[PDB]
Design a binder for this molecule. Structure first.
Ligand code: AMG
Ligand code: AMG
Lengths: 41, 264, 206
């Protein structure tokens, strides 16, 4: 996960935050659809 | 602070922001419950237990087709059968009794002192409830793709995405306990899914609030603004094209044109 | 393993690598690219020192990763510090140069714009606007109350599974007009549609 400010707009910022969430949030352990953080990577 | 909650006392609000209220503070094993202006009165406090029971004034909410008809009452908790005092609350705002699977708590009229009743579940705004102690409507902007804001257009008759402008009155929405999304300047007006279509999907517009099952919305954790239920549909910017001026009700797929943010 | 790495690059093409403990979702250390130095918060977990940046000189900062400690060391609070594209660019540079004058301030910017935005859609959206209009903003109580209550909100979400979505305790949040909103259940969009990641407290289920 990388954020380069040169090529940065609202769209790429949200994509970056989106990727952080996907990599940190559990695929399986969710409550009301909200993921719990993973225990390990 | 602990991961187990034994009991809690809160309010239940819904239809037009009114509160579930046991009529007149009566305690007779059979008294009736109405919608009434929300206040701090003890007959509007409801206590949830690990039973699955919901209680006001010491007596618990009940429904028996024989006993009280399809009307909803409080009785003595030991005097009637367990099956009739069970309750389940869903994320979409449906309050129902697990044993009577087709029915759901309803308020057939929008008026003060209306009798609450069990009716067939059609996922109507008259069947939408907020369990929680903050009863007021949540005011904010609704932000969609390209960071554009939902606007009430054409003298509060239509709606689509415009550029956000802070404090613009037409961009301010009120989210009610019944699951309605209302025009902030005019609370008789509800975001509504029409029978009129675009690319074979219903189009969203502003009509008079009438308590029906196309004025009821739930904000979920996937970022969607959805209809309650299993056969779920999401608010959707047609063709991911802001310029089309068309918000439709589409099959859920979770892409950017179906993602929204409440900016409160 | 336990640490997630994350790279930020300024408009001067200076890159820093920031290490995040996935268990608490806090920043614990960083390294400027092409350096033999690394910098660790005073309260970084022990395991961080043994597993991260082990081929560097590991410096220990004289403040910790809590907001209070950061604010104390910066000499001002979050409600005074501007966020946006250029503050972030500035922040990256200061970390890259390891400028001890500007470190606490720069961490406050970066943590909010990256980690806190990841936790909350409301914060993500506030930041996205700053990129669009290329204009700076200062967080108000709406943002700050979310940051300060994330742990407690996560606990109450988990706790709510035992009693119909009701919280065991009230959380006090603010809206953009600084009105108080006491939330005591999940049935509010400012919880359910806002919290994007939750801290683990207990093993429960829906
Ligand atoms: C004077 O009002 C009283 O009766 C009405 C019923 O009409 C409501 O139940 C209200 O809670 C109660 O205080
Ligand atoms: C092919 O589908 C695309 O257009 C339809 C409208 O027909 C919807 O907007 C959908 O979200 C979009 O991906």
């Amino acid at each position: 996960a990388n954020l380069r400010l040169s090529e940065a707009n609202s769209g790429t910022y949200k994509t970056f935050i989106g990727r952080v969430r996907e990599e940190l949030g559990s695929e399986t352990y969710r409550l009301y659809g909200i993921p719990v953080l993973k225990h390990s990577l | 602070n602990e991961c187990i909650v034994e009991t809690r006392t809160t309010r239940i609000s819904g239809r037009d922001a009114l509160c579930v209220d046991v009529a007149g503070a009566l305690t007779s094993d059979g008294s009736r419950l109405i919608l009434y202006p929300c206040g701090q009165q003890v007959n509007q406090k409801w206590t949830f237990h690990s039973d699955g029971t919901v209680r006001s004034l010491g007596k618990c909410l009940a429904t028996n087709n024989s006993k009280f008809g399809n009307l909803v009452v409080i009785y003595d908790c030991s005097k009637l059968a367990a099956e009739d005092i069970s309750w389940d609350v869903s994320v979409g705002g449906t309050i129902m009794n697990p044993n009577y699977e087709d029915l759901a708590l309803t308020s057939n009229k929008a008026t003060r002192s209306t009798n609450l009743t069990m009716e067939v579940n059609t996922y109507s705004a008259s069947q939408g409830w907020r369990v929680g102690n903050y009863v007021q409507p949540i005011i904010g902007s609704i932000v969609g793709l390209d960071d554009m804001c939902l606007e009430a257009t054409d003298g509060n008759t239509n709606m689509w995405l415009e550029e956000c402008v802070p404090n613009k009155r037409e961009q301010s929405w009120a989210l009610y306990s019944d699951g309605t999304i209302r025009v902030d300047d005019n609370r008789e007006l509800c975001v509504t899914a029409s029978s009129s279509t675009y690319d074979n999907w219903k189009v969203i517009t502003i009509l008079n609030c009438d308590g029906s099952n196309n004025q009821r919305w739930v904000f979920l954790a996937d970022g969607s603004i959805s209809t309650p239920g299993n056969q779920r549909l999401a608010m959707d910017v047609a063709r991911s094209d802001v310029d089309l001026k068309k918000i439709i009700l589409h099959r859920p797929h979770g892409d950017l044109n179906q993602q929204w943010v409440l900016f409160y | 393993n336990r640490f997630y790495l994350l790279t930020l690059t300024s408009n001067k093409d200076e890159s820093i690598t920031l290490a995040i403990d996935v268990e608490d979702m806090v920043a614990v250390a960083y390294q400027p690219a092409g350096s033999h130095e690394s910098y660790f918060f005073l309260n970084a977990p022990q395991l961080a020192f043994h597993t991260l940046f082990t081929d560097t000189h590991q410096n220990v900062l004289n403040f910790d990763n809590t907001f209070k400690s950061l604010e104390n060391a910066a000499g001002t609070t979050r409600q005074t510090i501007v966020l946006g594209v250029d503050p972030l660019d500035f922040a990256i540079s200061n970390l890259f140069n390891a400028d001890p004058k500007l470190l606490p301030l720069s961490f406050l910017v970066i943590i909010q714009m990256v980690l806190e935005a990841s936790k909350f859609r409301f914060i993500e959206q506030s930041v996205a606007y700053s990129f669009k209009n290329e204009k700076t903003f200062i967080p108000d109580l709406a943002i700050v109350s979310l940051e300060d209550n994330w742990s407690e909100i996560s606990l109450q979400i988990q706790a709510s599974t035992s009693l119909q979505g009701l919280f065991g305790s009230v959380v006090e949040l603010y809206n953009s007009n600084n009105e108080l909103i006491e939330v005591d259940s999940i049935y509010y969009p400012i919880i359910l549609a806002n919290v994007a990641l939750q801290l683990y407290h207990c093993q429960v289920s829906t």
